[PDB]
Amino acid sequence: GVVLAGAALGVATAAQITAGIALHQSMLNSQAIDNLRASLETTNQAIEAIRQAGQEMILAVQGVQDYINNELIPSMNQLSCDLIGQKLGLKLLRYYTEILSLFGPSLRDPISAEISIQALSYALGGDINKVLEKLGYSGGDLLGILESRGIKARITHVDTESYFIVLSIAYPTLSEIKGVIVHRLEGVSYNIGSQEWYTTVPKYVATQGYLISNFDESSCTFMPEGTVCSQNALYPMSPLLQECLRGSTKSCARTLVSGSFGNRFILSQGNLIANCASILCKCYTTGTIINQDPDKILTYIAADHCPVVEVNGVTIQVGSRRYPDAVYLHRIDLGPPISLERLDVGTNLGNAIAKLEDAKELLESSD
Amino acid sequence: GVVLAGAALGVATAAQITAGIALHQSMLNSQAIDNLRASLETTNQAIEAIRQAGQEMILAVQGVQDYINNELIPSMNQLSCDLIGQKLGLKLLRYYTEILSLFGPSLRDPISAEISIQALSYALGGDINKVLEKLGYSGGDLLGILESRGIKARITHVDTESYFIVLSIAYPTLSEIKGVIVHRLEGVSYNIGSQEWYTTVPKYVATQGYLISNFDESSCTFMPEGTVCSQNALYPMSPLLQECLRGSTKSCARTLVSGSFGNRFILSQGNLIANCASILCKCYTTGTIINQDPDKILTYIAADHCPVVEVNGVTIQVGSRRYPDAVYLHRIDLGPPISLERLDVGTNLGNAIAKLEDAKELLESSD
Amino acid sequence: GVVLAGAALGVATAAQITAGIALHQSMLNSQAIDNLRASLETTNQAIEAIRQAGQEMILAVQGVQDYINNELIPSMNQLSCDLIGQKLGLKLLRYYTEILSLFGPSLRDPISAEISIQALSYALGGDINKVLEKLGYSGGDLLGILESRGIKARITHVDTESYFIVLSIAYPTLSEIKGVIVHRLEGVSYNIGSQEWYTTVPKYVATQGYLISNFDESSCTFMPEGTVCSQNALYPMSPLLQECLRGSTKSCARTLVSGSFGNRFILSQGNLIANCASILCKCYTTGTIINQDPDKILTYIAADHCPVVEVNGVTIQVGSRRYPDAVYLHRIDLGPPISLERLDVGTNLGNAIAKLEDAKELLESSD
Amino acid sequence: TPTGQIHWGNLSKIGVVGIGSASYKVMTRSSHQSLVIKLMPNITLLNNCTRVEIAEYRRLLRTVLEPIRDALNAMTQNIRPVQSV
Amino acid sequence: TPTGQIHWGNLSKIGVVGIGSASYKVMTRSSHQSLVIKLMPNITLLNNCTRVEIAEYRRLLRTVLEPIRDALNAMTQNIRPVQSV
Amino acid sequence: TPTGQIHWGNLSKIGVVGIGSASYKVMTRSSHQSLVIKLMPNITLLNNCTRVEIAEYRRLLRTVLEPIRDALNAMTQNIRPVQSV
């Protein structure tokens, strides 16, 4: 059991406190270093499992040894002595540049940094597949491939006497989290006059019991049996937008198709939802066009009325009705039109606060 | 004529429906594949036009064949058998890593994906110029260069028996769109006291008949005879910001020069607009300084008053007046000051909604 | 002394005006070019200081000469004539692709562009360390390393007769700016019920006399003796958010821990601030748990009450009290809860403007 | 001096000018051409010196290729001739 | 047809549908394994032909390595055994 | 304990602390130095084995270089000596 000297250190984040303790627990012992220093001195491979009975295996990687062994040494008795040194000299500078990029000053707090195995790719010789294979990853299924690429490293020792960096790795394993469903949302445009709108919702949202949350898909990859994320992906959603997703159409905002737009129909639950004011819809079974009531904004096409529909030139057989017949626009409460470009948001907000600071001075006069 | 089985497939976007039909129409016939499989087996080039009379040419690309042919085979009788296999083994793993990056699970829906020719660069051997030349692109003018780099590919067949990927490409051609003018906007700072402001407008906007639109320049490159975009670039603009650009100065927001700022003058229509409170303006013809009326915010410099002006040390001859003499600040309605950093927007919005939820409870009391 | 022909040029930014004058002042003389053209013709190095007595040194860089000199020429009497040309031909196309990427049409205004030395890395042969060493940079301390990587180049001549590009470089030196302190901010979560909140403030802010500013850390690297930025980093902050940082707790917004969250405690001024409702806090000296008053949101742990505390399993000795005992939540004015995802901001803003446009029509009726 | 939608005079009073206009051109795709990425190189003139490395490469590729092949087959099995109706 | 929180019917009236759901899996780190980046290559079979280049490389590395080494030592000097209390 | 603008006490009541300050240094450019990218390599010791490849490279470069050369010449033709006034 160890204690952190908090008064001396004075200030530290939880991330820095926890990495420091982990640093103490995971760093090699003072004499494991002299042994490691000696084992490194006598090896000559690009990748090598350093096995000392008693201690655990230490994986040693040398970023330019394959180049020396494959390209320079077989040339030893065909090229001049300057040329061998010049050839290697170019490689060493390119390697130094990568060390500088990764461990240099752009690395904000090296002590608490967790460096992805992929970021180490160049430092490890330009590829990580043999390194992973030595650690037990085969590449034989895509989940194991994803897990391996979630490995992160922390720095535990930097040796200025023999020039090597000891890192500690941890193995990722997958944690399915109980209640949380990720949902992918998709909109189609609708017409008011000749204007094409669509309702603005996030590409992914998450449900979590009663709560609806925002979902950042940046760090996720969508396998067939679940979304696998390397980061927290869940984030709060405003009550107003949650109400939108709960059925309050007036709460959802909407924006124009100002440009080109490729979503005027979609296949859903075996039905076609189509803006048949903006594209040609046609029943293939009967040969008759499908016009969209001009006081309706969408058409919901099912086999009760058209078993096989042609839609913008694409012919689709549909199943039995799973969405009700379109209602009149006057029976749909639309929400506010907005623009999402960030400078428009700031300009309209700046106006709104100014009107609102105004409004408190008339509501002094009338009260 | 083919039909999509919509009830079986159940759910699909327009992009997925259209790529699937295109997949059926563009995939090689079952026996074109056995012929292709046999033609690939017997070839030995990095790039090769596979011509079978009757069928169209198929361009075959082998990502490590140049390395084998140029570097390994001439070494066959100077290097050991392990070393040849080790040399190639490093190349194959680096190639596998790139295939994994491009076609692996991070590729969200491979069926409807459109992969740029540039993203294929490594899969095609590290460069695309000879591939394009075989397709008819010379590199002889910059428009043809831009068009070639807008080529996108779709996947039409993945062969696990002989390990090859068939892609279908389409050729871009340029569509000038009728009414739409892209405009680049540029501001100069102005002084209220010693405070330097500038009005916040987008870097590019687009006019389209009566409408002003936002313009995303991310996917565009600005040739001398037009803006060429690989994506839709047009997007809606709020009525409020459109009014700003239509002459309503009170509708435009503004923000500080909190830092360093290099836009205190600009040459426009042969005149100089300059914040001559913040830099030294001087008439070179007469030798006399140009002071900015302290109740004015800018100076509009023309040859009616100074044929050759010196401005922050730069000497510019100007032409006849195309902008009126500056007016007093009190004859200019300035709009709201705002800050654009996203966390400031959220903090001020959160305050505004709270005051606005307040305001409805006093407007119950007074009504 | 030179003058810019402003009527002819008609329109230009300050950046373009200033680069044009600098272009006139820094371009090589018409006969320095013929001399340079002849010196280039006769050299055969990858990097070479071209010294002509009288004129200053000109550093000449040839992007594929090391490959020719080290790899092709020693092979001259072992490989066929096609193969030598094929080997180089691959290198030349890869080099052309990089020239196209950097100087081609994606370079918006080449005349006024300032190209970082790092962006030139490939054009200069894949590495910049020997180029910098010839210019006097040793790599011996990290500040000199940072300064060297802030070098920017402008284009001063493009020769279509002999195919070379003359660039003019300038040397960065460090300017500490007088009044400005950069501050890094860090929050811990607190509990209302079982809900974990934290207050939303920027990661970095800057103080500058009486003003608090936003700070964009994108272009900065955090050395031990100062923040070094390649760009202006200072930007305005809204009065509302400045009031938040000045002690007005009601002005600071707040958001949920919707997901996982690793900041439930922090070491600060030798004390522990901890959400002891969300993790186990324990006095190690006495062995007694530290419960958080359920009507308090945080615990401020000091040596007046616990010299050595255990906190989520980590044992920390703390110093004397530097933060007062937690107060009751009812003695703390919390600000608005918000969500920062940009589509939530737009949806709530769109609602707020609509209610606010409503509000002006009732305030006509009651007045 | 161009004119139109945007009100250059009143904008110039608050420091905004236009510094360039251009027409707007978008890219359209037409026609077709097949490109095949040949994943197995021709190695016969290397006389089996690379057998282990090639076999391991081929094995690594299957894990990536099989799911795409399955997705393509899944789609075309829902693409029928017209008359099945 | 799935159901729950999100109200698919009313959203369909304004053109929004769900096109896929999935469970949510996050990664956890456990255990340990040491990896050492050996910065000095084995050059003896090159018979001192690379001495100048190696020495310059080693010199460039120190500038990067020393500050990290110092930071690691600074931290562990504040990590004591329990009983110093 | 530092003090100033930012009110550390009241922020600490809502979980916010400062974990580091630094001075602010910006970069200034001065002086000049010419760098020339020599696009044509010296190939004489390759005895014309690369003529086709060099000629094609040189041809590809012109398309990129000519527009920049034109832009530079367009500007300096508007940069005159003082006395033309």
Ligand SMILES: *[C@@H]1O[C@H](CO)[C@@H](O[C@@H]2O[C@H](CO)[C@@H](O)[C@H](O)[C@H]2NC(C)=O)[C@H](O)[C@H]1NC(C)=O
């Ligand atoms: C789905 O549709 C409509 C929204 O258009 C909802 O009906 C509204 O209900 C509110 C009260 O909840 C009434 O004040 C409105 O008058 C109704 N709107 C209209 C246009 O008639 C319906 O309840 C929605 N379902 C859900 C779960 O929100």
Ligand SMILES: *[C@@H]1O[C@H](CO)[C@@H](O[C@@H]2O[C@H](CO)[C@@H](O)[C@H](O)[C@H]2NC(C)=O)[C@H](O)[C@H]1NC(C)=O
């Ligand atoms: C250009 O300038 C001014 C704005 O400063 C406009 O004049 C205003 O016109 C409105 C009605 O349209 C009046 O209520 C204001 O009193 C005027 N403002 C001032 C300060 O006098 C002028 O119309 C603008 N031109 C356009 C097209 O908007």
Ligand SMILES: *[C@@H]1O[C@H](CO)[C@@H](O[C@@H]2O[C@H](CO)[C@@H](O)[C@H](O)[C@H]2NC(C)=O)[C@H](O)[C@H]1NC(C)=O
């Ligand atoms: C620090 O804490 C509180 C905010 O919670 C401040 O006290 C408030 O002061 C205002 C007037 O300035 C009063 O109207 C409020 O009644 C007070 N709030 C409460 C909950 O009692 C205190 O002044 C703050 N310090 C600073 C510099 O703002």
Ligand SMILES: *[C@@H]1O[C@H](CO)[C@@H](O)[C@H](O)[C@H]1NC(C)=O
């Ligand atoms: C490098 O390689 C040889 C052979 O593996 C090894 O025995 C020797 O100790 C290493 N060289 C040095 C300087 O340690």
Ligand SMILES: *[C@@H]1O[C@H](CO)[C@@H](O)[C@H](O)[C@H]1NC(C)=O
């Ligand atoms: C590889 O190359 C030779 C010569 O082009 C060709 O005839 C042979 O069929 C190819 N090898 C294999 C295994 O197909």
Ligand SMILES: *[C@@H]1O[C@H](CO)[C@@H](O)[C@H](O)[C@H]1NC(C)=O
């Ligand atoms: C290339 O190299 C030789 C030796 O440096 C030099 O003398 C010659 O002039 C150069 N070749 C050409 C074509 O200029």
